[PDB]
UniProtKB/Swiss-Prot annotation:
It is found in: Cytoplasm; Nucleus. The chain holds residues 30 to 195 of 443 of the full protein. Keywords: Cytoplasm, Nucleus, Phosphoprotein, Signalosome. This is COP9 signalosome complex subunit 2. One of its GO terms (biological process) is neuron differentiation.
């Protein structure tokens, strides 16, 4: 059906250089991201090139583009692992000051009810950064939501 968008995701896949890799990726997405399955894998790859090669302000624009494809386009199974590993790369690489903006802006998109372990595991790990920060005020609101999720995890 959409044999076009599948191969331009794979044509813009190799590259090696970031140079113009992200412009040909965007020509896959912006052939109308109708289904959003190859709009996701176009942007997913753009993220792994943006944060790793210096440009985090440019990244967060594309980061929030990706988070649109959760209620539609992609299932929660694959989209769960997508943000997991993209935070694992930024967790070990950059520090608190570039990691915490993405933890918050993730949960903004996760205004979700059926997300239990998807919602809880981001919110549990938001409550760890706020202890190093000395941000105890908002940290209590985080713990109030966490505690109210159960009333395994209540420990």
């Amino acid at each position: 059906v959409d044999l076009e968008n599948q191969y331009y995701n794979s044509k813009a896949l190799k590259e090696d250089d970031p140079k113009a890799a992200l412009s040909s990726f965007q020509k896959v997405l912006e052939l109308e991201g109708e289904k959003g399955e190859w709009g996701f894998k176009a942007l997913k790859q753009m993220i792994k090139i943006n944060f790793k090669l210096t440009n985090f302000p440019e990244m967060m624009n594309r980061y929030k583009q990706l988070l649109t494809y959760i209620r539609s386009a992609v299932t929660r199974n694959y989209s769960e692992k997508s943000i997991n590993s993209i935070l694992d790369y930024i967790s070990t690489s950059k520090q608190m000051d570039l990691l915490q903006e993405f933890y918050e802006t993730t949960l903004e998109a996760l205004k979700d009810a059926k997300n239990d372990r998807l919602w809880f595991k981001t919110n549990t790990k938001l409550g760890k950064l706020y202890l190093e920060r000395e941000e105890y005020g908002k940290l209590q609101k985080i713990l109030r939501q966490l505690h109210q999720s159960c009333q395994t995890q209540l420990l």
